[PDB]
Amino acid sequence: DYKFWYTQPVPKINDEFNESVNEPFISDNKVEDVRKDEYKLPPGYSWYVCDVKDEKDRSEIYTLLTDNYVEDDDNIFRFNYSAEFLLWALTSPNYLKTWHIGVKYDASNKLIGFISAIPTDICIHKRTIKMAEVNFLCVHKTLRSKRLAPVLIKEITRRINLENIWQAIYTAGVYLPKPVSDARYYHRSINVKKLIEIGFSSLNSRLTMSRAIKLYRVEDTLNIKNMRLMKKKDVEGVHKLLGSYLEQFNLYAVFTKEEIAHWFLPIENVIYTYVNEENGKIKDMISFYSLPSQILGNDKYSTLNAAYSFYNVTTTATFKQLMQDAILLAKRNNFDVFNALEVMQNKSVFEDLKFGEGDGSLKYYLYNWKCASFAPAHVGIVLL
Ligand SMILES: CCCCCCCCCCCCCC(=O)CSCCNC(=O)CCNC(=O)[C@H](O)C(C)(C)COP(=O)(O)OP(=O)(O)OC[C@H]1O[C@@H](n2cnc3c(N)ncnc32)[C@H](O)[C@@H]1OP(=O)(O)O
Ligand SMILES: Cc1nn(C)c(C)c1Cc1nnc(-c2sc3ccccc3c2OC2CCNCC2)o1
Ligand SMILES: [Cl-]
Ligand SMILES: [Cl-]
Ligand SMILES: [Mg+2]
């Protein structure tokens, strides 16, 4: 019935728009009309302004997400973003502290809910719009289905609107009104035996353990011999190679140089970017971020280390060669599995590179924006 979502400026479940329609649901908004009062929480709970740059506040958010964030369909794996990853995700250029919103239960002083946004320029069907990117919405498991999430969403919308920003982008595995695109995820096994033992992957009578390990074996040599970790000096060249590439898609972020530096310079166990430089020119890039899963109820293993394909561009090799090197560089950095979405050119390499189709998909949404939906090959943004 979507009783909350139907009160919001998003498409109805049946809405379908021509390619010519590309505009807000509600235009001519006025900063001066936005509510100044915080939305009301139930008795005994209060808003909390989180300082993600303080280790202790950042620790509280980490604990909340570690225990209560997203689980796979079978409740065996739960995302386990690290504290340094949350730091990086939330302190991008021109971030606002007041868009990092916690909810505490007054009597324990414990964080029980969270929601965040960062500002990003988003190009949708060739119109660039100042938006908020929303992520890390989470309500403690003990307080589910109490209608707290619409409170968090309405409060962040109010604070975003105070900055004269009236559109947002977000992704969810759940179906809401109404996806602008829908991308399945695929997984390429790296540590086969481990993935079998935790029930991420399976065997069978044809594929014995030894034959499954042989199947996923990779040669420890790069297609692009000079691919190396990105350094500060490469920010200009990355901004030109990526910025040009992305303009073909129907939905992408428009990065400034300061955004390239933030989103790509390598941070161990967070973000890995590699470049191929020729003549002082960046001609190819690979990137992926680290998003481990906590494994629930396995006696031997508690963590699955997973590399998540972010942005990959090649001008000197085939896309298949580039993605093969991405898998190898993930392997060299101790990752058990390489995960990709069917966005950009990704799907075209999944069969040859031995990726397996996963169990669900990620829906891309816009808030207060009406437009034609599109196949995921035309999606040119990867969220965290
Ligand atoms: C202009 C600026 C605009 C800014 C804002 C833009 C929009 C931002 C929107 C947020 C984008 C976040 C993106 C993001 O973070 C990445 S998707 C990750 C979401 N987090 C998790 O799945 C963590 C585990 N789950 C939870 O913590 C709770 O289940 C949550 C908190 C998800 C819902 O808590 P609950 O205790 O289970 O539920 P109630 O409080 O009773 O609330 C039920 C209402 O919530 C609607 N709902 C449920 N899940 C949602 C989801 N993932 N997006 C949006 N809405 C969601 C649901 O359809 C229902 O509305 P309806 O009756 O109409 O159906
Ligand atoms: C696998 C998996 N493990 N777990 C713990 C979950 C809930 C899933 C399902 C899932 N839900 N979102 C995604 C994926 S796969 C992928 C590959 C490359 C880039 C992004 C993603 C992605 O979503 C990202 C970005 C949106 N938030 C979650 C991670 O995967
Ligand atoms: Cl209201
Ligand atoms: Cl482990
Ligand atoms: Mg609730």
From TrEMBL:
<feature type="binding site">
    <location>
        <position position="5"/>
    </location>
    <ligand>
        <name>tetradecanoyl-CoA</name>
    </ligand>
</feature>
<feature type="binding site">
    <location>
        <position position="147"/>
    </location>
    <ligand>
        <name>tetradecanoyl-CoA</name>
    </ligand>
</feature>
<dbReference type="InterPro" id="IPR022676">
    <property type="entry name" value="NMT_N"/>
</dbReference>
<feature type="binding site">
    <location>
        <position position="299"/>
    </location>
    <ligand>
        <name>Mg(2+) 2</name>
    </ligand>
</feature>
<feature type="binding site">
    <location>
        <position position="148"/>
    </location>
    <ligand>
        <name>tetradecanoyl-CoA</name>
    </ligand>
</feature>
<dbReference type="InterPro" id="IPR000903">
    <property type="entry name" value="NMT"/>
</dbReference>
<dbReference type="InterPro" id="IPR022677">
    <property type="entry name" value="NMT_C"/>
</dbReference>
<dbReference type="Pfam" id="PF02799">
    <property type="entry name" value="NMT_C"/>
</dbReference>
<feature type="binding site">
    <location>
        <position position="145"/>
    </location>
    <ligand>
        <name>tetradecanoyl-CoA</name>
    </ligand>
</feature>
<dbReference type="InterPro" id="IPR022678">
    <property type="entry name" value="NMT_CS"/>
</dbReference>
<dbReference type="Pfam" id="PF01233">
    <property type="entry name" value="NMT"/>
</dbReference>
<comment type="subunit">
    <text>Heterodimer composed of NMT and AK2; AK2 myristoylation stabilizes the complex.</text>
</comment>
<keyword id="KW-0808">Transferase</keyword>
<comment type="similarity">
    <text>Belongs to the NMT family.</text>
</comment>
<dbReference type="GO" id="GO:0004379">
    <property type="term" value="F:glycylpeptide N-tetradecanoyltransferase activity"/>
</dbReference>
<keyword id="KW-0012">Acyltransferase</keyword>
<feature type="binding site">
    <location>
        <position position="136"/>
    </location>
    <ligand>
        <name>tetradecanoyl-CoA</name>
    </ligand>
</feature>
<feature type="binding site">
    <location>
        <position position="139"/>
    </location>
    <ligand>
        <name>tetradecanoyl-CoA</name>
    </ligand>
</feature>
<feature type="domain" description="Glycylpeptide N-tetradecanoyltransferase C-terminal">
    <location>
        <begin position="197"/>
        <end position="373"/>
    </location>
</feature>
<feature type="binding site">
    <location>
        <position position="137"/>
    </location>
    <ligand>
        <name>tetradecanoyl-CoA</name>
    </ligand>
</feature>
<feature type="binding site">
    <location>
        <position position="69"/>
    </location>
    <ligand>
        <name>tetradecanoyl-CoA</name>
    </ligand>
</feature>
<dbReference type="GO" id="GO:0005737">
    <property type="term" value="C:cytoplasm"/>
</dbReference>
<feature type="binding site">
    <location>
        <position position="4"/>
    </location>
    <ligand>
        <name>tetradecanoyl-CoA</name>
    </ligand>
</feature>
<keyword id="KW-0479">Metal-binding</keyword>
<feature type="binding site">
    <location>
        <position position="2"/>
    </location>
    <ligand>
        <name>tetradecanoyl-CoA</name>
    </ligand>
</feature>
<dbReference type="InterPro" id="IPR016181">
    <property type="entry name" value="Acyl_CoA_acyltransferase"/>
</dbReference>
<protein>
    <recommendedName>
        <fullName>Glycylpeptide N-tetradecanoyltransferase</fullName>
        <ecNumber>2.3.1.97</ecNumber>
    </recommendedName>
</protein>
<comment type="function">
    <text>Adds a myristoyl group to the N-terminal glycine residue of certain cellular proteins. Myristoylates adenylate kinase AK2. During the asexual blood stage, may myristoylate proteins such as ARO, CDPK1 and GAP45. Probably by mediating protein myristoylation, plays a role in the assembly of the inner membrane complex during the early stages of schizogony and in the formation of rhoptries in the late stages and thus merozoite egress.</text>
</comment>
<feature type="domain" description="Glycylpeptide N-tetradecanoyltransferase N-terminal">
    <location>
        <begin position="28"/>
        <end position="181"/>
    </location>
</feature>
<dbReference type="GO" id="GO:0046872">
    <property type="term" value="F:metal ion binding"/>
</dbReference>
<feature type="binding site">
    <location>
        <position position="149"/>
    </location>
    <ligand>
        <name>tetradecanoyl-CoA</name>
    </ligand>
</feature>
<feature type="binding site">
    <location>
        <position position="143"/>
    </location>
    <ligand>
        <name>Mg(2+) 1</name>
    </ligand>
</feature>
